[PDB]
Amino acid sequence: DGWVKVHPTPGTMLFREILHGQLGYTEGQGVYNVVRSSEATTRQLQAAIFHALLNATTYRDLEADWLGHVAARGLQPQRLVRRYRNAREADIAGVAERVFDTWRNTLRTTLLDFAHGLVACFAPGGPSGPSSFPKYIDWLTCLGLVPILRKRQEGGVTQGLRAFLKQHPLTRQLATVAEAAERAGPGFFELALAFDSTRVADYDRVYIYYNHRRGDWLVRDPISGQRGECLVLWPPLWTGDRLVFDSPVQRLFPEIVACHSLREHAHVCRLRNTASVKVLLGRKSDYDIIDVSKSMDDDTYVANSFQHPYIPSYAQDLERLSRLWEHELVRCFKILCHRNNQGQETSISYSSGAIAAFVAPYFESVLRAPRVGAPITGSDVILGEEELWDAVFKKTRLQTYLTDIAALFVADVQHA
Amino acid sequence: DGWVKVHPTPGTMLFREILHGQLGYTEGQGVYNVVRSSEATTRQLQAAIFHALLNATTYRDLEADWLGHVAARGLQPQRLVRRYRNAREADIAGVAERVFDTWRNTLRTTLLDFAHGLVACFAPGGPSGPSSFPKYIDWLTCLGLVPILRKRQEGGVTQGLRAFLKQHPLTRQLATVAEAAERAGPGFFELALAFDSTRVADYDRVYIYYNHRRGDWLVRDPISGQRGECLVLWPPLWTGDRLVFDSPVQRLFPEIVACHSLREHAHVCRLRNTASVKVLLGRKSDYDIIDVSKSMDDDTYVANSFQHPYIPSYAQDLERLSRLWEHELVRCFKILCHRNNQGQETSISYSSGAIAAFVAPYFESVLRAPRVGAPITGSDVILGEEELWDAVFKKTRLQTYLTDIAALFVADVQHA
């Protein structure tokens, strides 16, 4: 009644089998390994966790902890000045600055350790299990559709967060850390539930239906009988008894088929020229391969015969396909290629817009995550975890408070 | 009832035999030797041990040890100033700074020696024996599955740790070293147990079963009858009476087979042209190789004959295959190639993302290790043991305490 099959047709399995390399392989197709990398999503998760944890800092409690540390050390400005009994301002100012610097560095490394501990719970479950990123990317590359299945339930990520947070000694050790953790807690649990709930379907099991007259999708899972919802990013085109997607493989499909047919024909022609000598026969009027035209003759004669051993060549077509594959995959997914002074492709990573165009829709619709803050740039992908934490730490709120307290302490260390 | 053989099929053994150069060898395939190196895991172990050992340092106890050293030397500020009896601040400050510098240098040397001694117990057992890394890498390269066998037991690593730790003179000599070792001890034992328990199955023994309907794995060891736990990073595809993996060898498989067949056909054609002259015979109407076609002639005649000694060429295919192998292995495993001003491939090592994508899951799942701290950078793989220890020593907790003590001593050496 207007419905039609979409995904499980063989003309769609052919696309995936092409993607696995069942129709030849090229150097250009090897760029696709970078496109599937889960580095961008892990960097985004690390940045989001760091922002959420460091945003809950407060000046009052951190100053209280600093005053408690000063009281523990017994190095108040009154006692220090009454002990030193000298007017050398530079020396005592440097002493106070170093005393503050030690505490600042220890607090920074403690916060780094806690942040890495928090990050460690999410990262492994991203690329594998429920809500897998490379599966999302290959869904996009093959069809442009991403079927998604949802169930509201708890599991590994939530249990991991509950086990990690509820007995970590740093919360008891530092009031500021515990306050920030309890303030930013609910967001972490909501993000964990978002990670757990969704699950992108598998390419060999799911069923997808399309009804042109209204333009809605019905996607079902035949094993469990579970109804899902279909996400569309680059909508297809319906031309009667057909349906043409606009995925990169669909655009690249005819060229590689033609090249494959050319290579097969060249192989067939190659196997023909094994024998060096050939013989031709015919009726009389009244290492070797022998041709017999004796039977078909009747009142005729062999007027003339020719030989021309053609062999098609296919190297130029393979070079063209390699370059075409590379250019298509670079321009479609916004891949930024780093280069040397003259050496080519020293490293490959996502561009600044590629993550905004691909990673952000993942977090926003595929996972339905609560928030991820301001997106990172295309240069923070290259940075390591420690470099990223240092980058976010300097520009965020906490550094301003830390530089604020030091100035006042250096000031009043000698005025009083 | 739906179960299918997966690994012991011949089409899987062919992949490993291809990996061992049974279908020809190329210069590009030689990059795979770097991919199997156990350098990254040893660097990660060294970094983890250094972080664990240095993070347990306590300011109070090392200050007490320094005060004990000062008491032993009899070089307290009171005695030193009362002996020198001069107002030359620069000389006395330099003397005190050198006195502290000798102690800090010898403490650094002692800590380095102890850290190397602790590291020496783990490193040999990594690449070989239980929990071998190159076997894991070639498991990933062949199929993408990593069957793993587990059994909780005590073994050589734990006995080595027990023999090394319980009678080391450094613990009795220094209170700081003993306290840090006692505090960090349980983690070392847990890591040793993690190293002992796991064992990656051998490629020529294990059995792997896959049931598409439900999608779970049953992996068994036929010799001991021990059931294992299967891991998957790059899930395969099921296309009816098949199973298509997405390992690099699977993607590269058709091309190398075509090249091998071309080379074999070229050899066969080459062996044919060894005779310079050829003779063709036929019935009369009413160093040499001679062809007899007179038997099949019957009321016929030889109308025409041809010769064309074809010899296929295969050098271009070999060069293309070498380049394809190299590019595939570079892009799939995220290999960073160092280069000269113009010279190519001065040295080859893991990139910053390669260790996070491959070394980190090994520790997380294959070993089930407790913790490894912050991951290292791809630039730290190049560094040696002493360089890595010095790198982790400067930015860790102990340096702040050591610099704090020096400034306070330099100040109080003359104000009192």
Residue numbers in the entry:
A (entry chain a), B (entry chain b): 24 to 27, 29 to 310, 494 to 623
What is the paper's account of this structure, in its own sentences?
Here, portal proteins assemble into a dodecameric basket-like structure that is thought to seed the assembly of scaffolding proteins, in turn driving the formation of spherical procapsids composed of MCP, SCP, and triplexes. A separate protein complex, the terminase, associates with the dodecameric portal and initiates genome packaging and the concurrent autoproteolytic cleavage of the scaffold.
To improve the resolution of the portal baskets, we carried out separate sub-particle reconstructions and refined them while imposing C12 symmetry, leading to portal basket structures at resolutions of 3.6, 3.5, and 3.7 Å for the A-, B-, and C-capsids, respectively. This density is weaker in A-capsids, but still conspicuous, whereas it is completely absent in C-capsids, D-capsids, and mature virions. Indeed, we found the scaffolding protein residues 449–455 (PYYPGEA, numbered relative to pUL26) to be a good fit for the small density. Furthermore, E454 from the scaffolding appears to stabilize Y608 via hydrogen bonding, buttressing the hydrophobic interactions between the three aromatic residues. Sequence alignment of scaffolding and portal proteins showed that Y608 and Y83 are highly conserved across herpesviruses, suggesting this motif is essential for portal-scaffold association. A- and B-capsids varied in portal height by ~2 and ~1 nm, respectively, could rotate up to 13 degrees relative to the capsid shell, and exhibited up to 1 nm of portal basket “sway,” due to flexibility between the clip and nearby wing and stem domains.
